[PDB]
Amino acid sequence: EQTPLQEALNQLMRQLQRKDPSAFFSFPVTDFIAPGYSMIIKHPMDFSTMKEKIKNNDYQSIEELKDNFKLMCTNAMIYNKPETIYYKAAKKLLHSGMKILSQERIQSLKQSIDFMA
């Protein structure tokens, strides 16, 4: 059984992943797919890793998941040049995810989570 915070994080994750229908961010980036990635990107992140962190009750707050989501998108904007499909998709996903992870949602969920304690 999961905590209200875990369930809230999973609901947000489901909406975030629907904004990545091409699965650009589903799985960790490998060096054979992205040569030098592990030397360039100091803190890799992907949706599957975020999902495991929710399951393992690693997140203390929605803001921590939001930071991880931003990190995943900006990593792709560092490794890929601005003209590329992957940079443009990362920037668009970042923009869409910031609406999904809005302060108004976070504030609403904080109250509900607190009330259910």
Two structure tokens written together for 106: 């976070």
* Cα-to-chain-centroid distance, residue 19: 11
Going along the chain from its start, the domains and CATH numbers come out as 1-117 (1.20.920.10)
Burial 9-25 (b: 16+ CB within 10 A, else e): beebbeebbebbeeebb
Experimental determination technique: X-ray
Instruction: Please report, for residues 17, 23, 30, 77, 85, the alpha-carbon distance to residue 40 in angstroms, rounded to integers and kept in the order given.
Output: 25, 22, 12, 12, 19
Interatomic CA distance for residues 117 and 114, integer angstroms: 5
Two structure tokens written together for 48: 């599957």
Interatomic CA distance for residues 55 and 67, integer angstroms: 17
CA angle 84/17/41 to nearest 5° reads: 50
Of 24, 28, 4, 1, residue with least CA distance to 96: 24
49 neighbors 27 (Cβ within 8 angstroms): no
Resolution, Å (one decimal):
1.8
Two structure tokens written together for 115: 């009330």
